[PDB]
Swiss-Prot record, chain A:
This is Protein C42. It comes from the Viruses. Belongs to the baculoviridae C42 protein family. Plays a role in host nuclear actin polymerization by recruiting p78/73 protein that is capable of activating an actin-related protein 2/3 complex to initiate nuclear actin polymerization.
From Swiss-Prot, chain E:
Signal peptide: none annotated. Keywords: Virion. Interacts with C42 and VP80. Interacts with protein 38K. InterPro entries: Baculo_VP1054. It is found in: Virion. This is Protein AC54. The keyword DNA damage does not apply. Structural protein that participates in nucleocapsid assembly. Plays an essential role in the proper localization of the major capsid protein VP39, and the minor capsid protein 38K into the capsid assembly site.
UniProtKB/Swiss-Prot annotation, chain F:
It comes from the Viruses. Its main location: virion. The keyword Transferase does not apply. GO terms for biological process: symbiont-mediated perturbation of host cell cycle progression. The gene is E27. InterPro entries: Baculo_ODV-E27. One of its GO terms (cellular component) is virion membrane. It holds the Pfam family Baculo_ODV-E27. Acts as a cyclin-like protein and plays a role in the modulation of host cell cycle. May promote G2/S arrest by interacting with host mus209/PCNA, cdc2 and cdk6. The cell cycle arrest is characterized by an intact nuclear envelope, concomitant with sustained activity of host cdc2. However, viral DNA replication still occurs in the arrested cells. This is Occlusion-derived virus envelope protein E27. It comes from Autographa californica nuclear polyhedrosis virus.
Amino acid sequence: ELINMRRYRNAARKLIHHYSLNEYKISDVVMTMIFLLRS
Amino acid sequence: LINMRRYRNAARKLIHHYSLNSTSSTEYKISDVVMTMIFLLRSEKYHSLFKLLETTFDDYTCRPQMTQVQTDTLLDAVRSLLEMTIDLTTVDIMRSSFARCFNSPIMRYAKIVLLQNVADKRTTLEELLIERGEKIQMLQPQQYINSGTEIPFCDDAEFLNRLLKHIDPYPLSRMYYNAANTMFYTTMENYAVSNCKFNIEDYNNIFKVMENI
Amino acid sequence: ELINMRRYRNAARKLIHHYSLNEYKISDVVMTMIFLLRSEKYHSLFKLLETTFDDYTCRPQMTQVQTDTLLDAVRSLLSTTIDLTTVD
Amino acid sequence: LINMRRYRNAARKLIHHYSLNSTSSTEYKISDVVMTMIFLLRSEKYHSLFKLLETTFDDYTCRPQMTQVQTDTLLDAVRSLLEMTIDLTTVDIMRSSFARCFNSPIMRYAKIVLLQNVADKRTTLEELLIERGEKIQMLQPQQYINSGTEIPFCDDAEFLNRLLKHIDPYPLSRMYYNAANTMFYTTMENYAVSNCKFNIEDYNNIFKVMENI
Amino acid sequence: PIKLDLCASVKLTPFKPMRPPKPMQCWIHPRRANCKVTRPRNDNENDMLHMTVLNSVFLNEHAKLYYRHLLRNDQAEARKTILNADSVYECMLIRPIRTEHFRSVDEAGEHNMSVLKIIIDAVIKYIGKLADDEYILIADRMYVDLIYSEFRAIILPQSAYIIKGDYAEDVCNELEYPWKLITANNCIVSTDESRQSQYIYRTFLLYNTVLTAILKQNNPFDVIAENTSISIIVRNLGSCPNNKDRVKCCDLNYGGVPPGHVMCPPREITKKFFHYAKWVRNPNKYKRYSELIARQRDVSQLHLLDWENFMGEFSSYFGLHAHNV
Amino acid sequence: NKVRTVTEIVNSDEKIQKTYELAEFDLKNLSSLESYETLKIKLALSKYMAMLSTLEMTQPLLEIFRNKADTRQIAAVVFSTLAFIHNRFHPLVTNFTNKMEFVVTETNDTSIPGEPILFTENEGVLLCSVDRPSIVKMLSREFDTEALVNNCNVRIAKTFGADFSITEVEATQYLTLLLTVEHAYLHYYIFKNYGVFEYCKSLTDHSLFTNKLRSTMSTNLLLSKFKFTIEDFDKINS
């Protein structure tokens, strides 16, 4: 392991779910893309 | 899959801008920082820089404590990335600026920031100047130019004209901007690393003096 | 016993939960931190807090299993769920 | 795992500060107190002092029971920690200050206070002076001097100026701060231990006189 | 309705020098009659201008409409005062970009916490331009009106009042050398408790503005009506189930996800504050309510502290600090 | 404020005005005055050190007063201190009265707070009670020889315009004992000038010192150099 991909996946989910339903940071989107790559 | 060429170029340009060595100002998108991060994640020699970027994803408040072998490996990696000088304070500038960007929220409007979080105790410029003078007085000179040495003015007016027409195609204003930005960069970084408060107000007052004349 | 860990545990749980919500005393903080130093399972949070001193420093990358262990250790101290943002 | 030496330094600075034996004035934080008490704990040879610290958590108005040999142990521990004299009333001052820290909850400022509740009956100064004088006359004086003993001013300007230049680098202002605060701390602790009212107003009146003269 | 000291004391018809707009409405504030929207007939796709009708009472001694005293680096493109007899008119020119529009603080219910961050930053620096010994009162509501696009926030004209204190250790005379011997600015006995009342007053104003920002239902805490006492308001609403010292704000219809207990302030602090703020009706008789907030005894200070805790946790809810206090 | 000064040659109307800033000259005057003050005080300190060394001490002062036995040298040091005070206050009389006694107090129930050292006549001659315990504890204290103590602009401008072993801590302790004897000798002046009753009244209330010494001191004190206060009265006395 090189990353706690739990935080990354949770940030990813929160961001995408927000964008689908309708408060985040560019930190958050880079975190999201990091998880996505990990997935 | 990621285009090594495009991701490489984005990472290089981003590190150039955040290093302040790039007086050139260009737009940075969320795509660009994502591009650089992805290159970091793909480049094994720069996976050290990738973990450093992750440490900036953290509270970015430590002074990352790396042994000297890791320090020099990191310097080699950043040198092979930027392809220029890049040194330790440049690395800590990377850390501070990129951690601040990380912190930054997404925003359709660009922003402007000023460096800090680089080299422990805020030092007032007053005592800083005092101590500087205390050393300098003890720093005895090592060179000298006695007499009012004649200025070696070049009487070769043909040389003057040749070099003039050589510099004539140069867009003077472009260089005005390059030089002024470079001076601001050096002064700001020095105030930050010296950890002395930067007085942008009197920096502008320097200009103001310059135009009042 | 050198020190009754029960009072320290009560103070620790109360402090962490209250801060999760958002009268106490600095000695209460001493008790909470002493339990934290005495409870091997929570010694992970012990390192986390001891690092937070000086600068806020940083929280070193924490494996999946480790983070699961810490969140379980917190949940035993409380039950409702938790996450990393509460820890932050 | 923590920096044993760093916590040792914090403990030493904190105890030297609250002991008022160090004129140096430095602020401390809850980080400092947790750090110092952790050092006190881990130090096997300071378990007794750590247990006194633990007892201070209560109302700390008790003078703890301790046998003379245990007193020897704790005085050895404090002498080792401070690496200096110091005596029991200093230990009472330790408990008073540390515990009066404990009783305070979290607040956004560092409160300044004055020692009290150290050594029973609430005392004033007039009967204190009377009893002191009668006790002096009770005891016998030790030394006697006679003759109009000449003031032995050292005539030779050589060593006069030698000692002068020896003291000339000294930053007098620090001398003033140290000595004045030493007067203040000893007066306050002597009044607190005696339970006599430490008249801060009279100390400030001594100041006022000094400016006016 | 005008008379004179003249023996006849003739009736003087109050002629109004200007011509106020006839269509006195504002789609930004449809209910607010005094709000007159006027999209200037011209990024210019969204150019803007709006006139607010106020009473000249909010004018100062130097003919300046009070709230304007804390506007610096005024992002608003244009702004100035006008008077038509008692009535007055503040017109503000603005022009967002094509993809930018400004929206009324009313019933905002905005879920974008960072937009709220920028709004609160604007208002907090605004009130920070206040002077410590100077106390302020607002006569329209328990908040400040403001309009805002995601990119930037622009204050609205306000029912603002500027009363200067005087802390007896700057003297209250400012009208120049010869004028002062005739009269001087009316100070009040500024004291630490009244000043902390003023700090917490700004803080409560900020809190109420944030509520209006996060509500889809009219914010009753902003009301000042005589007929509605804050006591009965707390009574009919209640205390937060998550904490009895707070109010039952957690259950309100927030625009976004309910912050719940987070938006529940302590009750009696807010009651003491509502009755501190009703001072506005009579600003002149200051001592009634000058330090009512910080007035006393032990219950007073301890609940002042738990309000400090609530406002501190509010600030940290976005990484803010109580330096404003 | 500012001093306009005219350079005029009457042969023509030509005048070349040149205003001068009084602030620079005031700062020079000040700087010279404090340098002279520091000079005089450090000369007094060095002279006191030299006369002490003419007493031929072996130990440093802290170990000197550490000794529990030899009250002879403690008393000699006390006499030397008080005689020096009486000297540079009243140089015409560079010698204290002929006879005196000494009692060395060793415990707190005999150590009086505020004025650990004191005089009191035996009805034949003044004698001194000396608080070796507390004074020695005072000496063994650490002193802030490592941290600087401090208008900014004036300070910065002046800064830019700028084998016996003794340490800065030794000089700190010497200043400390010197000011203690300053205070004690002022009390003793109250004694010998206004009676034992007024001696006690000055001991209890030192505001009387200004009144009493307006007759003598004005026509001096080393401690008058700096301005002294106790920290944080705003929220201490609150």
